[PDB]
Structures are given as C-alpha cells and as structure tokens.
Design a binder for this molecule. Structure first.
Ligand SMILES: Nc1ncnc2c1ncn2[C@@H]1O[C@H](COP(=O)(O)OP(=O)(O)OC[C@H]2O[C@H](O)[C@H](O)[C@@H]2O)[C@@H](O)[C@H]1O
Length: 190
C-alpha cells in the first residue's frame, strides 16, 4: 500500500516519479514499452494488453497491416492507439533499444522514445502522460544509465515546451529509489 512518490515543477509543467502499475494510471496517455511487431509480449507490454483487453491487439494488427504496410515500428519511434479498457484515453506505443545491439546509437534512440512521445502529447493537446522504465526489463538497458537518459530528456523537453504532467511509473522500489536519486541530482544541476 505505501507507494513512494516525488514531484518537481518545471515552468508550468510537473514531473512526477512514482511506484505503481502503469495500467492503473488515469493520465490522458500511457506509454507502452513494445516491440516492433506491436503484437504484445510480457512485462509492461503484456500488462497493458491484458488490462486494455483484446481490442488493443486488433488495433495494433490493423495499424501494422494498413498504415505501416506490414513494416515494424522502428526503435525510438511511436504510434498511438486508443486506451480501450485502460483508464487512459490513449496508448503511445514505442520501441526502446535492446542494450548493446547498437551501442553508438542507443542513447539517442532511447531519448527518441521520450521526445517522440512528448511531441505527440503536445500535438494532440493532451496534458498528461505516463512512462514506464523503457528498455530496462527484457531489453537489458542498465537502470542507472536509462534513468539518466529518460530524466534528462523529459526535463529538457519540459524546459522548452508546455506539456502538463509527465509521470514516470516505476514497477519496483529499487527502480524508484534509483530514479529519485538521479532526479535529485539533475534538479540540483538546474
Ligand atoms: N504494469 C507495469 N507498470 C509499470 N512498469 C512495469 C509493469 N510491468 C513491468 N514493468 C516494468 O517496465 C520496465 C520495462 O520492462 P519490460 O516490460 O521487460 O520492457 P523492455 O522495454 O525492457 O522490453 C521490451 C520487450 O519486452 C516485452 O515483451 C515487449 O513486447 C518487448 O519484446 C521494467 O522496469 C519492468 O519491471
């Protein structure tokens, strides 16, 4: 029942980090750590598909067959679907880098997930979004490095743009603790 949280205001925006389950967030948008196929998986992708219900998979399949003409979603890029049975209005699906598959591009590619998702929130005039810890599960990205990239990217975006609320939802107290220390470090540098 205790779930740690902390927040920081950046101009008129708010950045919050929390322990929780992203499928229970009532932000306008939640972000899925997907794979290029968009057909689901385990971890957060599996949780989102289970919570959203079977209409999500159908929607992803139709997006693959029509708008993508069978192509997979590239690493760092985003697509948007409805939230279906989630408490959110939309799901932004992204694909994080698989750790050390492309060592010279992966920091940029991870940042892209966050920047592209936030640009889409801006475009659609949505005012709240939740992120998971993209790429730090099965994709193997070290949490200390990923948390730095995630937070630096979000902070920079919120310094330069009006968005609203950005939440990072950590699934463990271990990840939360690391995020908290990184966020505090980054705030002191502002
Ligand atoms: N309900 C949840 N809410 C928030 N975070 C969660 C939840 N469940 C897990 N996490 C955390 O979410 C974070 C990311 O872990 P992972 O979900 O493996 O994502 P990746 O980007 O590394 O792997 C993508 C692949 O895994 C899938 O099969 C896809 O289809 C791809 O094949 C971790 O901190 C988890 O503990």
């Amino acid at each position: 029942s205790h779930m740690a949280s902390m927040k920081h205001n950046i101009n008129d925006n708010t950045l919050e980090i929390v322990v929780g389950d992203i499928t229970k967030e009532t932000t306008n948008v939640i972000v899925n750590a997907a794979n290029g196929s968009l057909l689901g998986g385990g971890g957060v992708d599996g949780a989102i598909h289970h919570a959203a219900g079977p209409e999500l998979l159908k929607a992803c399949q139709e997006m693959r067959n029509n708008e993508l003409n069978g192509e997979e979603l590239p690493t760092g890029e985003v697509i948007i679907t409805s939230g279906f049975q989630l408490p959110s209005r939309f799901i932004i699906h992204t694909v994080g880098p698989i750790w050390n598959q492309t060592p010279d591009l992966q920091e940029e590619l991870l940042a892209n997930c966050y920047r592209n998702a936030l640009e889409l929130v801006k475009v659609k005039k949505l005012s709240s979004i939740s992120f998971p810890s993209i790429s730090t599960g099965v994709y193997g990205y070290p949490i200390h490095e990923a948390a730095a990239i995630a937070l630096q990217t979000i902070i920079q975006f919120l310094q330069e743009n009006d968005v609203g609320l950005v939440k990072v939802v950590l699934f463990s107290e271990r990840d939360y603790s690391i995020y908290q220390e990184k966020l505090k470090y980054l705030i002191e540098k502002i």
